[PDB]
Design a protein around this ligand. Structure first.
Ligand SMILES: Nc1ncnc2c1ncn2[C@@H]1O[C@H](CSCC[C@H](N)C(=O)O)[C@@H](O)[C@H]1O
Ligand SMILES: CCCCCCCC/C=C\CCCCCCCCOC(=O)[C@H](O)CO
Ligand SMILES: CCCCCCCC/C=C\CCCCCCCCOC(=O)[C@H](O)CO
Ligand SMILES: CCCCCCCC/C=C\CCCCCCCCOC(=O)[C@H](O)CO
Ligand SMILES: CCCCCCCC/C=C\CCCCCCCCOC(=O)[C@H](O)CO
Ligand SMILES: CCCCCCCC/C=C\CCCCCCCCOC(=O)[C@H](O)CO
Ligand SMILES: CCCCCCCC/C=C\CCCCCCCCOC(=O)[C@H](O)CO
Ligand SMILES: CCCCCCCC/C=C\CCCCCCCCOC(=O)[C@H](O)CO
Ligand SMILES: CCCCCCCC/C=C\CCCCCCCCOC(=O)[C@H](O)CO
Ligand SMILES: CCCCCCCC/C=C\CCCCCCCCOC(=O)[C@H](O)CO
Ligand SMILES: CCCCCCCCCCC
Ligand SMILES: CCCCCCCCCCC
Ligand SMILES: CCCCCCCCCCC
Ligand SMILES: CCCCCCCCCC
Ligand SMILES: CCCCCCCCCC
Ligand SMILES: CCCCCCCCCC
Ligand SMILES: CCCCCCCCCC
Ligand SMILES: CCCCCCCCCC
Ligand SMILES: CCCCCCCCCC
Ligand SMILES: CCCCCCCCCC
Ligand SMILES: CCCCCCCCCC
Ligand SMILES: CCCCCCCCCC
Ligand SMILES: CCCCCCCCCC
Ligand SMILES: CCCCCCCCCC
Lengths: 280, 95
């Protein structure tokens, strides 16, 4: 695929392979201490940072190091899910789901829209309120797992969170592929000379299938963690953000395609409950 | 432009009926802007239009000479999570 797309794929899988070997070695040799595993990973994390900076220029390295970091998180997540105490294994699957989301998001844009692929395509915030929400779900888990270890040992509940995240991920990426170059991480206020209306595929089910997948995926992450406080908070925060986003987004779509989108609003719903869009 | 919202909103050049406005784009990625302009304390609702998030200027026409106006810039960005509309910046200018 695109050059920037190949850089991310080489770094992501290469980094995944490197730390896969490290974790395999640490497991078969009984290397169990959390801080020893931390320093072994940190040691080689430094090596990948400097080998990549040597082989890539500024633009490519910015992409490569993020892809390598996400591969690191992926393997460490699966590593934790397999070997950590049942009190903690849940967090490993959450880490892996998160890493795959952000990387596959970059790869989708690289496949579908090579012209504007940037470090922003990893869709990482990098927003104080958003970062607090993310960290607050980490502290809830570990505070709750310390006082109520049995809560995080209900693996069938967490695996339900796995299912909705996979489903939401499939829905999301399919939408990006179906929309082609009509997709964009940034809402467009001006009509491109090649921008056409998409009403087939998952766009026949929902008007905003990528937001539907993102909406349920985000809730799913907190079902994985079995976080009783973050699940409703994430649901509401997610819901209000897409209500605002969809509202302005459909006002621009009506000016783009006029009655074609008006007819599309009458035939297909948004896909998120209680969000109507730019319509009565 | 260290701020996370639009700053340094200003009329650069003006004619009795039109304005050339400009602002400092925030340090964050902006999808689009919404520009509003209306007669300061007028009876009519204000006007509105959109400019791409990559631009930092706009032009307003059809204004009455010698009238006080209030202009406001709204940035839309994922940085404002869980909101999508950002905090506004306003100025006043008499044509
Ligand atoms: N049905 C459609 N057909 C073509 N483009 C669409 C579209 N719906 C939204 N878009 C465009 O896609 C960009 C956002 S990407 C998100 C697309 C859609 N809201 C979804 O969730 O699947 C916006 O700039 C918007 O103009
Ligand atoms: C661990 C592996 C990560 C990468 C390590 C350095 C290898 C440099 C790759 C050369 C450029 C390929 C980039 O490929 C390209 O983009 C070509 O233009 C098309 O194949
Ligand atoms: C790329 C393909 C294979 C990995 C090559 C780098 C080796 C890192 C793992 C050695 C590190 O393994 C070790 O032996 C350390 O002592 C601890 O794991
Ligand atoms: C500070 C942040 C730490 C981040 C990552 C550290 C890597 C976690 C792996 C711990 C290995 C447990 C290994 O434990 C085991 O596998 C044994 O079976 C437990 O007795
Ligand atoms: C049904 C089989 C388990 C379903 C859960 C995850 C499937 C994908 C990860 C499999 C490796 C983790 C096994 C072990 O996973 C775990 O133990 C975690 O705590 C998940 O509960
Ligand atoms: C592995 C992760 C999960 C992947 C999920 C796969 C998607 C499953 C959902 C829909 C599959 C669509 C196939 C049938 C289309 C028929 C449409 C029209 O139908 C009709 O009109 C016929 O009468 C139906 O019989
Ligand atoms: C839960 C539901 C969402 C989960 C997974 C999404 C799978 C989408 C599969 C249908 C693709 C239609 C794609 O169809 C097409 O693009 C052509 O029209 C086929 O004729
Ligand atoms: C685990 C993996 C489970 C995935 C299973 C089914 C996913 C179906 C993918 C359908 C994508 C078609 C969009 C393709 O659309 C296009 O690319 C055309 O440009 C549409 O006009
Ligand atoms: C730069 C562009 C990124 C925009 C970020 C906002 C996008 C979609 C809103 C997602 C709604 C759920 C947010 C929950 C806190 C956020 O935490 C999460 O969603 C993770 O699952 C952490 O557990
Ligand atoms: C698990 C996720 C399942 C469903 C999503 C629930 C969304 C609830 C939004 C309620 C906003 C409520 O919004 C309001 O109250 C408005 O003023 C009118 O609806
Ligand atoms: C393991 C995922 C690899 C994705 C490669 C996609 C390449 C798309 C090329 C389009 C012509
Ligand atoms: C994909 C990461 C593999 C890390 C090694 C885990 C081996 C543990 C197996 C216990 C069933
Ligand atoms: C059990 C510790 C409680 C701290 C986490 C509260 C989560 C509230 C979500 C607000 C984003
Ligand atoms: C943050 C990741 C925490 C992993 C804890 C694993 C403990 C195993 C002893
Ligand atoms: C981030 C540190 C988490 C420590 C968890 C220890 C579990 C054993
Ligand atoms: C305890 C640190 C967990 C970090 C998860 C990061 C996932 C997004 C990359
Ligand atoms: C047409 C593009 C197909 C790429 C799917 C991966
Ligand atoms: C942008 C990268 C910021 C990393 C912060 C890590 C804190 C531990
Ligand atoms: C949503 C994940 C926030 C933490 C990112 C840490 C890696 C940069
Ligand atoms: C970075 C802070 C992680 C806190 C986990 C408890
Ligand atoms: C000193 C009192 C300690 C009480 C422990 C209760 C734990 C509640 C976790 C939410
Ligand atoms: C698997 C479902 C278990 C319910 C108890
Ligand atoms: C997840 C799909 C549930 C149905 C919600 C559709 C609401 C659209 C109203 C416009
Ligand atoms: C998961 C679907 C929740 C039910 C949607 C209700 C739609 C309200 C109109």
């Amino acid at each position: 695929l695109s050059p920037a797309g190949k850089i991310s794929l080489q770094s992501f899988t290469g980094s995944s392979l490197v730390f896969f070997v490290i974790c395999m070695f640490n497991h078969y040799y009984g290397i169990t201490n959390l801080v020893v595993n931390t320093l072994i990973v940190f040691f080689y994390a430094v090596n990948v940072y400097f080998f990549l900076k040597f082989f890539y220029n500024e633009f490519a390295f910015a992409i490569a190091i993020r892809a390598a970091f996400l591969g690191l998180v992926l393997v460490l997540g699966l590593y934790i899910k397999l070997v950590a105490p049942p009190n903690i294994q849940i967090f490993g699957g959450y880490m892996s789901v998160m890493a795959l989301f952000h990387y596959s998001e970059f790869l989708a844009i690289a496949i579908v829209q090579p012209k504007q692929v940037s470090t922003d395509s990893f869709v990482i915030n990098h927003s104080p309120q958003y970062t607090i929400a993310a960290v607050s779900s980490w502290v809830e888990f570990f505070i709750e797992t310390y006082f109520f270890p049995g809560l995080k040992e209900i693996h069938w509940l967490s695996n339900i969170g796995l299912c909705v995240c996979i489903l939401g991920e499939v829905l999301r990426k399919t939408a990006i592929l179906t929309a082609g170059s009509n997709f964009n991480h940034l809402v467009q206020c001006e009509k491109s000379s090649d921008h056409v209306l998409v009403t087939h595929g998952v766009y026949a089910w929902f008007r905003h299938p990528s937001y539907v997948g993102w909406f349920y995926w985000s809730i799913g992450t907190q079902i994985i963690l079995i976080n009783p406080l973050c699940i409703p908070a994430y649901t509401l925060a997610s819901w209000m953000f897409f209500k605002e986003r969809i509202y302005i987004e459909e006002s621009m779509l009506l000016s783009f395609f006029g009655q074609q989108y008006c007819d599309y609003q009458q035939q297909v719903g948004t896909g998120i409950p209680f969000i109507e869009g730019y319509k009565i | 432009a260290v701020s996370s919202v639009p700053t340094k909103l200003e009329v650069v050049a003006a004619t009795p009926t039109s304005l050339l406005i400009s602002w400092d784009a925030p340090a964050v990625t902006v999808d689009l802007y919404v520009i509003t302009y209306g007669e300061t304390g007028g009876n009519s609702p204000v006007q509105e239009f959109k400019v791409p998030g990559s631009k930092s200027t706009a032009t307003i026409s059809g204004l009455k000479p010698g009238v006080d106006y209030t202009i406001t810039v709204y940035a839309f960005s994922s940085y404002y999570w869980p909101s999508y509309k950002g905090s506004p910046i306003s100025i006043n200018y008499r044509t």
